[PDB]
Amino acid sequence: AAAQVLSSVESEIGRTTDPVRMYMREMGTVELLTREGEIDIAKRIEDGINQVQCSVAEYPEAIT
Amino acid sequence: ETLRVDPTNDRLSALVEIYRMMRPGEPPTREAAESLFENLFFSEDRYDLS
């Protein structure tokens, strides 16, 4: 519900212009993900590029 | 009559508004505003009278 915080605070931001606050407020939205985010995201990347290397079969087009 | 215009009832909203005036644009977190309030006046390092 971090975008909801953006909603209210932006609703009464004190005419802020510093991008520092903006960037930190934005990156603080998405929280950390630890001890399985690493592995399951790697296995999703596995799934993607190995779906690719499966796609890499059978090229009459790319005969080279 | 000033109390009659006092919007708050709790400690926490007052602390929020203080944190707000001194750090606009950021959202509130309790311990931040608390340590801020106490260090402005009750920390020996950030305040001295001579």
Swiss-Prot record, chain A:
Sigma factors are initiation factors that promote the attachment of RNA polymerase to specific initiation sites and are then released. This sigma factor is the primary sigma factor during exponential growth. Preferentially transcribes genes associated with fast growth, such as ribosomal operons, other protein-synthesis related genes, rRNA- and tRNA-encoding genes and prfB. It comes from Escherichia coli (strain K12). Belongs to the sigma-70 factor family. RpoD/SigA subfamily. This is RNA polymerase sigma factor RpoD. Contains 4 domains, connected by flexible linkers. In the active conformation, the domains are in an extended conformation, each making extensive interactions with the RNA polymerase catalytic core. It is found in: Cytoplasm. Interacts transiently with the RNA polymerase catalytic core formed by RpoA, RpoB, RpoC and RpoZ (2 alpha, 1 beta, 1 beta' and 1 omega subunit) to form the RNA polymerase holoenzyme that can initiate transcription. Identified in a complex containing RpoD, the RNA polymerase subunits RpoA, RpoB and RpoZ, CRP and DNA. Interacts with Rsd; this prevents interaction with the RNA polymerase catalytic core and with promoter DNA, and as a consequence, promotes transcription from promoters that require alternative sigma factors.
Curated annotation (Swiss-Prot), chain B:
DNA-dependent RNA polymerase catalyzes the transcription of DNA into RNA using the four ribonucleoside triphosphates as substrates. Belongs to the RNA polymerase beta chain family. The RNAP catalytic core consists of 2 alpha, 1 beta, 1 beta' and 1 omega subunit. When a sigma factor is associated with the core the holoenzyme is formed, which can initiate transcription. This is DNA-directed RNA polymerase subunit beta. It comes from Escherichia coli O45:K1 (strain S88 / ExPEC). The lineage of its organism: Bacteria, Pseudomonadati, Pseudomonadota, Gammaproteobacteria, Enterobacterales. The gene is rpoB.
